[PDB]
Amino acid sequence: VLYVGSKTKEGVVHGVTTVAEKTKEQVTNVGGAVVTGVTAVAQKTVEGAGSIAAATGFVKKDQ
Amino acid sequence: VLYVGSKTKEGVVHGVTTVAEKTKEQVTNVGGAVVTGVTAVAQKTVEGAGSIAAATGFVKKDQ
Amino acid sequence: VLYVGSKTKEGVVHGVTTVAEKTKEQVTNVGGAVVTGVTAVAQKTVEGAGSIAAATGFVKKDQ
């Protein structure tokens, strides 16, 4: 597999903006997982039997 | 497999904007997972038997 | 596999902006994991049987 290409920005994330003029915010949690705000992730190649990537708010109590 | 191409931005995410003039926000959770706000993820190639990618608010209690 | 290319910014993340004029924010948590604010991660190549990458707010009580 060869690769001449012109311009390949593959497997990325960029240029994200947010604004939150929040006022009087209250959160509470027990045991579970909670994510406010923002987050951003990118990864080119991932391989794995029963593997995990790209989870936000993810709980696994498997047996 | 060769690749000459002109312009390939494959497997990406970019340019996302949000605004939330929230006021008096209250959250609560036990055990489960809860995500406010935003998030953005991209990944080119993923391979795996029974593997997971791209989950927001995902719980797995498998046995 | 050879690689001539023109411009490949693959497996990255850049250029992210946020604003949060928060006022009177209260958080509380026991046991679980909670993430306010922002975060950003990128990784080119990841390989592993049942391995994990790119988790925000992730709990694993597997047996």
Side-chain angles (χ1 to χ4, degrees), chain A residues 27-29 32-36 57, chain B residues 27-29 32-36 57:
Chain A
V27 184
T28 304
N29 164 35
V34 50
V35 183
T36 318
Chain B
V27 184
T28 304
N29 164 35
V34 50
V35 183
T36 318

Side-chain angles (χ1 to χ4, degrees), chain A residues 11 15 23 30 39 48 50 53 56 59 62, chain B residues 11 15 24 31 39 45 49 51 53 57 60 62:
Chain A
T23 59
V30 187
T39 180
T56 73
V59 314
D62 164 78
Chain B
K24 172 54 206 81
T39 180
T45 310
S51 301
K60 179 188 187 184
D62 164 78

Side-chain angles (χ1 to χ4, degrees), chain C residues 1-5 7-63:
Chain C
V1 50
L2 65 89
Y3 205 102
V4 170
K7 166 180 298 177
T8 81
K9 210 151 47 192
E10 60 88 6
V12 312
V13 52
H14 76 87
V16 47
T17 74
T18 64
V19 179
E21 200 155 336
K22 301 168 73 176
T23 59
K24 172 54 206 81
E25 289 65 30
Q26 159 173 357
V27 184
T28 304
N29 164 35
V30 187
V34 50
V35 183
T36 318
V38 316
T39 180
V41 177
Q43 56 266 18
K44 177 190 180 283
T45 310
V46 176
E47 169 181 339
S51 301
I52 309 170
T56 73
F58 158 54
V59 314
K60 179 188 187 184
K61 305 169 175 282
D62 164 78
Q63 306 192 8

